[PDB]
RNA sequence: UACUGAUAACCGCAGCAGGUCUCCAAGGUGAACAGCCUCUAGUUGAUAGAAUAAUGUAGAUAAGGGAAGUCGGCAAAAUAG
RNA sequence: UUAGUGACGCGCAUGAAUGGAUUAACGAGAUUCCCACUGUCCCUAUCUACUAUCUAGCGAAACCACAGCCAAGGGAACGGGC
RNA sequence: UUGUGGCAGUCAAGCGUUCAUAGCGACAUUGCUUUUUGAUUCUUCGAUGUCGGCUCUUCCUAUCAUACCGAAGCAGAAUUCGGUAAGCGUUGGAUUGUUCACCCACUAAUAGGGAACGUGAGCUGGGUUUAGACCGUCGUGAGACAGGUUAGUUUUACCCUACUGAUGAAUGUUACCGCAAUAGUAAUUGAACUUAGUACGAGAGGAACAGUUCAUUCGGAUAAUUGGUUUUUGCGGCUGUCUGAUCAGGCAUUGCCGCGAAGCUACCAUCCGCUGGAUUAUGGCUGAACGCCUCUAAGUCAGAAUCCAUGCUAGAACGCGGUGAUU
């Protein structure tokens, strides 16, 4: 017999299975569409989610009521030290898909990245890539031909890069490593560009620019084994109910005499791969610079790191990003940035953004002061201030 | 933009941070924090509360 | 709103569901307004339609004049008592929740208003602006 | 004519949260051998250790509204001297 | 408002100690409405102790043709088996 | 099985100002469905837990709305009929145990149904459905009444499967980077301004596409802000009592209050939610048969909430590749 009063599917089934990811570093499924008219350049980036904060700016959409008025917006901050390019691989295409035929690395490597190759590093000979360097230590002994092979073949190229987890304030010492597709120019140009960029930093001033809409790709925060009621948004059953109300009551009919997949069920919430899009960048900023927190309107020399620091992160002394809104992922976590796939204009992706003020107050409480100068000014001296 | 002054503590209210209250007599109060808000709802006197600017300036401290 | 939506509205946090009694602010004879419906309301299962500031509604009078009592009438909210958030992030709330009788088009059957109102309603319903003492 | 007189000596198949007649009965609070703390006397027994997911059991609080829930204000709150 | 109350009464089949009609007070009685109150609810969230959980040790029971993947078919007309 | 219930056809006397067919369509008639109710008694009486609601998924379409279209006794608006279409959605309440019905109101619209009349080791137990009891009628009486009322124990999963999540031997070892078979899939609807008081219309009244800003529903994240929560038993205070008094503390099943960070969390907060191709219906291009003509027969264009891809989720644990170091 039919459902007496209608209502929709609780939850979304495209996002199934709701299971723990394969990694703490979300796979980038898809990059943009390669084009040759442009120059060779990256199409992605890596950083570490630091936290959120709040800003002020003057909206401009001709027809709103806050047109040419102030707003206040929640932004999310990423610490993006420049990634060390080492290596590239070549993907030839088959009816069975793209396929790597070669992975060319660089001669010299950092302890962080070969640590990522290792697990127990403190008891190790640190024997890695030595015979690769000895394939190096000559002009081109067994490298030039791999490169020219990649030139003769390999419709697609992906550059291997790694992060600077020691530049971060974290406590890992184990670099993150990944690939990025290049979507510019020709293949020979891509590979020689990468050869030039072996062992070399690359930075966000080169990959991105303000008022660009992007995708944030990351793994969403783990919440353990969880009931159906938070995991799906199901109605709490009523008070008088023997044996539990944080449940689904019927989980299927007599026939088919099975539990349908679409029914809700308890289990893992979080640590899930997610790919959110259309996150306008509001500011690139520099580690090797002060006044990161200061707009043209404020001009009070102050960086972005609030008083007492980011909660669970620390400081932003590297190059960093401020993007509108939330993103998948929690603090201290990796994040994979990405150019869009589609030239969304919409009078929302083109809205040019200039900022006014940036909350640099303490998130470890309810902070009244953006600066200890301001603090001492408002308060006067103190007993400790001899 | 501008910054404002808690009715109770007399503190700068940077934009968004804090609550606002509009009594039936159209008096618009602002509160940096639920602390001040809750005291206000308790109908306390900041001149009697010690950490407040009013007590500070009424006892002539930081002159 | 719909009909008398002089422009649009931004969402406001919702605190006045059906069953809510809210004060009447105007000079129409009333004392209270029992909300029973909302215009432009959403249709979801075992969800109570909730009113807002500016939301026209259908209401009844449980207390007041026997010409107004025992019949529905359109009414408009001007006060909410539920902290909502404007685009400048200011979280603001009144102490009370009230409204005013109207016609379907939005013109107050009453000729005045007793207290403060919301700038959203004042910008969306011009007759309320006309009969407004103070706005915020 | 010892001893227990009961969350182990009695009856409940048992070292069962049950049942089984009575005497004595301190101090303070407070109307009160109420409830709460203490003195004398008596006990420190009941498998324990590590973590703290769901679902539960027992206890609680929750903005705005206020029974719209439901067979039904069931339960809980509010009131309380 | 199929409820509740007040009236009407060709009452299928009301009715006088097979007791009728009221009836203050009383009721862990049945029922309706109003005030208050509220996580009953919109719409869920959070916290605590005991569990479950893992361990050491102890260590049952119900039930059991054989066992345990679906669809259609036909079939004792709704199969785990064909 | 389908009388009966329901649904759809054939024919066309007539209605429709005139005209059978725009729309309806009596008398007659052919079928379908099993959501009624009968009829039957095949299974089931060494028991298949028996109405409804709640919850929750999935399916059909005889499509209520939404997408695109055709016809009109369609000037416009509004409406009616019909096609592809079940992608997507289909409410809150009053009374009733109710299914159903009837009203109120919003609504884009508030369509019908199935899954052992879905679902009780999922709830509840109003109702029905033991025993108590009351009334009425029937009965000489004990007692009877799908007649009315009231009160009346709702047991067990630790096994297998299914399901959700989670590990995992074996592939020469180990680590890293990848591919992507297959499966899943999602975004939905409305308003306002403008177009424009224009078109259209004698007048009355009264559009539309594009554009902009907003919202409804659903989803996926996040916790800067606000709110909540508070065993931070962090700070302060309060009562009773004990520690000779103070200082500082214990007990009060977390003693109570106010504040309360962190963390968790909320349409109670915020942010985001893609674009290309083939197609249906339909309208058409050339075009014969049928020396004309015809969207069709060969060929062919555009065309939808459709379909498939883009994209998104998992990654075959017996699918694969690249790379490093290999005692």
Swiss-Prot record, chain A:
Deletion consequences: A mutant confers resistance to trichodermin, a trichotecene toxin produced by plant-pathogenic fungi.
Signal peptide positions on this chain: none
UniProt modified residues of type Pros-methylhistidine: 242
One Gene Ontology cellular component: cytoplasm
Source species, domain of life: Eukaryota
Main location group: cytoplasm
Annotated InterPro entries: L3_arc_euk, Ribosomal_L3_dom_3_arc_sf, Ribosomal_uL3, Ribosomal_uL3_CS, Transl_B-barrel_sf
The keyword Ribosomal protein is assigned to this record: yes
Keywords: Cytoplasm, Isopeptide bond, Methylation, Phosphoprotein, Ribonucleoprotein, Ribosomal protein, Ubl conjugation
PTM section of the record: Methylation at His-242 by HPM1 is required for proper 60S subunit assembly and promotes translational elongation fidelity.
Location(s) in or outside the cell: Cytoplasm
Misc. comment: Present with 450 molecules/cell in log phase SD medium.
UniProt similarity note: Belongs to the universal ribosomal protein uL3 family.
Subunit structure: Component of the large ribosomal subunit (LSU). Mature yeast ribosomes consist of a small (40S) and a large (60S) subunit. The 40S small subunit contains 1 molecule of ribosomal RNA (18S rRNA) and 33 different proteins (encoded by 57 genes). The large 60S subunit contains 3 rRNA molecules (25S, 5.8S and 5S rRNA) and 46 different proteins (encoded by 81 genes). uL3 forms together with ES39L one of the contact sites for the signal recognition particle that targets ribosomes to the endoplasmic reticulum membrane.
Protein name, as recorded: Large ribosomal subunit protein uL3
Source organism of the structure: Saccharomyces cerevisiae (strain ATCC 204508 / S288c)
Chain's gene name: RPL3
From Swiss-Prot, chain B:
Coiled-coil intervals: none
Signal sequence range: none
Modified residues (Phosphoserine): 7
Localization in the cell: Cytoplasm
Taxonomy, superkingdom: Eukaryota
Family: Belongs to the eukaryotic ribosomal protein eL24 family.
Subunit structure: Component of the large ribosomal subunit (LSU). Mature yeast ribosomes consist of a small (40S) and a large (60S) subunit. The 40S small subunit contains 1 molecule of ribosomal RNA (18S rRNA) and 33 different proteins (encoded by 57 genes). The large 60S subunit contains 3 rRNA molecules (25S, 5.8S and 5S rRNA) and 46 different proteins (encoded by 81 genes).
Miscellaneous information on this protein: Present with 247000 molecules/cell in log phase SD medium.
Role played: Component of the ribosome, a large ribonucleoprotein complex responsible for the synthesis of proteins in the cell. The small ribosomal subunit (SSU) binds messenger RNAs (mRNAs) and translates the encoded message by selecting cognate aminoacyl-transfer RNA (tRNA) molecules. The large subunit (LSU) contains the ribosomal catalytic site termed the peptidyl transferase center (PTC), which catalyzes the formation of peptide bonds, thereby polymerizing the amino acids delivered by tRNAs into a polypeptide chain.
Name of the protein this chain belongs to: Large ribosomal subunit protein eL24A
Species this protein is from: Saccharomyces cerevisiae (strain ATCC 204508 / S288c) (Baker's yeast)
Lineage: Eukaryota, Fungi, Dikarya, Ascomycota, Saccharomycotina
Residue range from the parent sequence: 1 to 63 of 155
UniProtKB/Swiss-Prot annotation, chain C:
Protein name, per record: Large ribosomal subunit protein uL14A
InterPro entries: Ribosomal_uL14 (IPR000218), Ribosomal_uL14_CS (IPR019972), Ribosomal_uL14_sf (IPR036853)
Modified residues (N-acetylserine): 1
Subunit organization: Component of the large ribosomal subunit (LSU). Mature yeast ribosomes consist of a small (40S) and a large (60S) subunit. The 40S small subunit contains 1 molecule of ribosomal RNA (18S rRNA) and 33 different proteins (encoded by 57 genes). The large 60S subunit contains 3 rRNA molecules (25S, 5.8S and 5S rRNA) and 46 different proteins (encoded by 81 genes).
Cellular component annotations (GO), alphabetically ordered: cytosol; cytosolic large ribosomal subunit
Organism taxonomic ancestry: Eukaryota, Fungi, Dikarya, Ascomycota, Saccharomycotina
Residues with N6,N6-dimethyllysine modification: 105, 109
Annotated TM spans: none
Domain of life the protein comes from: Eukaryota
SUPFAM superfamilies referenced in this protein's UniProt entry, alphabetically: Ribosomal protein L14
Organism: Saccharomyces cerevisiae (strain ATCC 204508 / S288c) (Baker's yeast)
PTM note: Methylated by RKM1 at 2 different sites, but it is unclear which are the 2 methylated residues among Lys-39, Lys-105 and/or Lys-109.
Signal peptide: none
PROSITE patterns membership: RIBOSOMAL_L14 (PS00049)
Miscellaneous comment as given in the Swiss-Prot or TrEMBL entry: There are 2 genes for uL14 in yeast.
Subcellular location: Cytoplasm
